[PDB]
């Protein structure tokens, strides 16, 4: 198995030319008890990028699991080095945690490339830490492997399942409809988080962790294990064993993250009822590995049926999903219908197909068979028009009442027209949504603008807007929704999302006005404002709607270099840098 | 916050011996504690840590302890974590029942010998809960129990698989050749999915509920599964409360009255608890100076089964907790006047006030008293010419068993069985499938030499299964009798804890294979049909052999341990009471 | 290396019991251990953890245990950490001496009753080193000692303050009024500047040096200050080497020969070690089935004082380590043919190959054997009519003491003094300055009722200081005699460990205040000049009283502890040897 190699660590700890610098490098790494024989025996230094902390409750389980990773690395013959990254906690980070993925990315590459690190174990959980980690590891391109934290346990409130995130959106409706009070709202929310781990619905965190499995970047079965199961700590051990293997065999990210691998992830996202936030993230990771993912790569997957019976699209939560076989069971379903490139290489050292043998699900209540699924055409639906060149709609989440109301008229199905109610940001929506002067009814479409990477800044999860109270009290639970921002992966709103280019850089949403008529055609992928070419340029000369001034040093940088979610809201200058571990850096003294 | 003058101050602020105060304070600062911390007069809160790598059922406390410390600090105490002697019931051989008294001795020493004003007793695995309470009673400084909690539900092939109970059910399946040997090892592993203790209503679940029923933990502390966020929140609230108990000076002997033990006896019956609760409750009471007699157990025989949990019922710890846990069970008993609700608890309220609003939320799990899972779920006390005290696990009689033995016409509750006697569990596993014994469905399987003295430490070996050939005919259980114990996770309706045991000359010593036993659950009698003349002839042959004492502690144990009917205590130790009423000598 | 059937496999891989294998395996995985780990056949390495908040001298081990774990894993073993009974010498009352045998009992149970193949014994505070080694020997599985090391140097007003020694020096500065009560407390505080044990050549520093001397720990592991990175590097190395010892089956009884204890006895004398080493070394020897007699102590008497460390000398643990530590001190002993340099050690090499190259690098701290600090530094045994064994701390005889009592031009080393007799230390503090006693420079202060049965657990109360009026006259110390002990940090040339102690009828029971005692350091005699007739008449008046037994463990101790001369062991316990050669029964 193990044929020796001169790891880049050896350029610090056994440098041929400079023996002064070598001694300078060994000296302090021994100040808490590491012996010289450890740092000088030619074992690989395995970094562990720690994401858990008191400020990051979704990832904090990695504070206890890190010990299992250390044990794996040491049994298998490496030397572990745990170190931190910029923290990211989506629930409390303001203005939004989307700001942090790129900032964490920058700091991880500096560390991975700047220290005597050979391979890495990326610890992941909360929404944006999985892409931030993978993005950084590929730019540097040293052998990497993802270790997922896992979701929380099932939450219960009065004998009822209660999913993280989705409990907030359902409780916003019942509090408006006067069916719950302000303390039941807080208490149902608290019941949604019964343990350590990330959101327990199929939101961004469960999606991005299933993605890394589909991408072949973590061991089989890693994504779905709930954080407090001992399975998770066993998995953390085996991941520590595996990463030294990947260091010796020299299996880098750029060997794994081919376009075919990204197409596998795309397929998985759709079959699993995954989050629309997966789209900016999968593109961002693709770009940073020099792969181009286009709007046609998403249309490819639209006709994947929904097969996992998990909130927000379905019924159960992360525990039932993982007991049913989690991501490998979903991938197996797909592989059987030829929707997977089964011959890609994975960090297991086998091929996707080889990994998936035996992974047929064990709970058909939870993971449905491909041919008798839960819903057809569950993939994202990219939409085009005069309002934006690209956006996606959460097809997996169209309710049957929503279907009957808009997508069901006898001659024209999948097509409907609605009256725009436009809001400039989240605060705007909350202040005017119940203003009867706007006379809102069942044939309106709620529109929000200024919530993109530039407008907010960092795109914001504010598109899952709810009907005004008077409509909620009539039983109308959702109206169509559209905006240039995002929504929580836990939303059960069939929104049109991630509209690029956003309003704030002169996308079509900059000139739309309340009372206009929007025409949605889901058969053809088109969404248009019925507003003539002449009126359009009259509005355009009034200028772009206003957006808040820059507030922090990082926001100035972000607003300067961030792309649109079309291409993954990436630091556009940064994609250029590839395989940085090929060249060494200069000595520091 | 009065403040009072805590015994710790005799170490850290003694105005007689200033040299000693300097000597006592010096080293306690060598990891960064400031003098204001130890010299301000805040109480020192000992935390008795039971969790370790070798104690996986209690290891959750390695994490929880930081929540306890935060609560002590918020409330104005100074925490002081220290360990006790490790106990891990599954791997400790010859038996972990040796360890309960050894852990008692050490913990008494630590609490009395050091400047500790009040203790948080972390509990979990079988024996850790009585051992902590016994010790905290003898020293009698303010004390509170913090339970660890069960593991989460175990699943294998979409079936609920319970800690411990899987092993016994797997033993019957492997013998009937229905599962492989790596499948046995497999489903055992499926039953232990997380940190925590046995997720069935075993000894840990029973004993931790008993601590709640005694009044020694905050309401709802017993049942919270170990990995729940709620368990961490409970550990914080408990750290707060122990500081208060230090100031209000609420001590074990203030709480462990005869009524509180009667309440605990009610709950064990209602909850389908382990029969190992019987020795542990008699031990705890003795060390508190309270007498628990066989008639106190008989008083709880007619309490109905209330909780629908393996091994007696269906679900595991997670469902029991979500339906209300121990408070929901105590609420049921309170409504029927089966509880003394006026007793004081460590919450600062009476049991009755703690229980208001605690009616269950899930009647599939915690049945109503008046239409329950089954009636007469209490332990049934048996006596006769083979022992003066044994109990039968009533809550666990199945329908086939009640048909085959308990339903003789005109004579219901009385049956007779032909004894097949084994000396140790090795002897059982060697001759149970020897056809020479010609075992029928009307035999009683008997094991002896497994009590406190015989094994030594009583051993969980009485849940013997039928021979291979009976299991293939659909006979899943014969009646069983022994002077040892069984796992609280057992679903055998055994007659257990037979005192006096065979090794000190109880009736089991002269029983022979072939003898007939007449059991009658109406009279409470269990008697071998052998005439006094033949008994005498047999007695003269001497007592059957038991192994030689093999470690120093076994020798101490064999010399001082009492019989299970009196708690298996160190007999000399129960005379020691309220030790914190007297300060120890200075050490220099 | 060559594979082995470790005893753990009897749990994790049983041939005839797959049910028990599943039951033993399942819960050991509930915090993430994989089946590949517990079934691969790698040895299971116990780590006997002694640190905690209540044990500040050993607390360093809670951060070093990770180093130990990493080394066990780099070497192919599976680490299993677990606690023992906590011991903290400074605060434990009535004495930490009661704990050594208690800790001993629990660790035997743990090592024998669980699947442990080899153990690392973390040590530090006084009693933890003998207690560990005693238990590892009784069970006799491959063992190794990891020492926590002493605290950093203490400075107070630009002066070295040593742990412990600063207390006894301050008690004199307080009666002579040179310091206030609150600078006493700051002075003691300055003595403890970091983690670690006492930084003087007290019992901790002695016993860890004894451990290395016996070949039970790696070369140079003893004197490394706890906060040094050398100490975590040593813990890693120790984790590695214990795996090797497990495969090579290098058991305690292979190492602990009479030749090894003799090497230890030499090192103690040569280093000015604590008198407490004598009962601990005898205790370890007995548990190793080795006899160590008063003659073997005499054989070390004439060894010079080589180490310039408080109490006897000047420096503290830091300078001693920088000078090459116990290796340098053994190297001296080697070249003068005072070691058995070819005994086996847990290093693989023999003691001679261990010390090749270990000559001290600082002759200001470790002196050459032939131009030494002082001569005849070993303990000096004394027989007599007051006791059949005692020892005197020859190493701390100062200039004035030698002049005032040991320098009669006729017969040097003989003197006679008047006995002032106190019954326990409280008697001392309430009468030492009672002027009706007429105490002068020619009195001997005597304390009794302070042995194993008397106190109970021998107490450190013999280093009594002169009355206040003698201290103001410049007399810094008088002869001191007792059946108790004294801190190994004490600079008192006391006569200690008197067996038989008073409380069981030894000579000190009949001796009275005012009697004349004659000591002869040339014959090793100490006698109370009182005639046989007065002795018999005083015995009729009864042994002087002692406090009643107060805790359950005290009753066990008083009923089983031996005398300090035979090691203060539980005498019934030394007959148990090589326990790991028999397996315990299965628990279910
Ligand atoms: S808050 Fe971190 S996963 Fe949703
Ligand atoms: S083994 Fe610890 S509770 Fe059953
Ligand atoms: S107090 Fe622990 S070493 Fe002296
Ligand atoms: Mg999110
Ligand atoms: Mg048990
Ligand atoms: Mg001492």
Residue numbers in the entry:
A (entry chain A): 3 to 591
B (entry chain D), C (entry chain C): 4 to 591
What did the study's authors say about this model?
The family includes dihydroxy acid dehydratases (IlvD, DHADHT, DHAD; EC 4.2.1.9), which are involved in short-chain amino acid biosynthesis and catalyse the dehydration of 2,3-dihydroxy-3-methylbutanoate, and aldonic acid dehydratases, which are involved in the metabolism of hexose and pentose sugars via the Entner-Doudoroff (ED) pathway or a modified ED pathway.
D-xylonate dehydratase from Caulobacter crescentus (CcXyDHT) shares 42% sequence identity with RlArDHT, and the crystal structure of CcXyDHT shows that this enzyme has a [2Fe-2S] and a Mg2+ ion in its active site, similar to RlArDHT. The structure contained a tetramer in the asymmetric unit in the space group C2. The enzyme is an α/β protein that consists of two domains: a N-terminal domain (residues Asn3-Leu358) and a C-terminal domain (residues Leu383-His591). Each monomer contains one [2Fe-2S] cluster and a Mg2+ ion. The substrate binding site is located in the cavity between the domains, but the [Fe-S] cluster and the Mg2+ binding site are located entirely in the N-terminal domain. The quaternary structure of CcXyDHT is a homotetramer, similar to the homotetrameric structure of RlArDHT. The formation of the extensive dimer interface in CcXyDHT (and in RlArDHT) is essential for the formation of the active site. Although the residues that participate in the binding of Mg2+ and the [2Fe-2S] cofactor are located in the N-terminal domain of the first monomer, the polypeptide chain from the second monomer covers the active site by extending its N-terminal helix (residues 21–33) into the first monomer. The hexacoordination of the Mg2+ ion resembles a square bipyramid in which Glu92, Asp129, Glu463 and a water (or hydroxide ion) are approximately in the plane and another water molecule (or a hydroxide ion) and carbamylated Lys130 are in the axial positions.
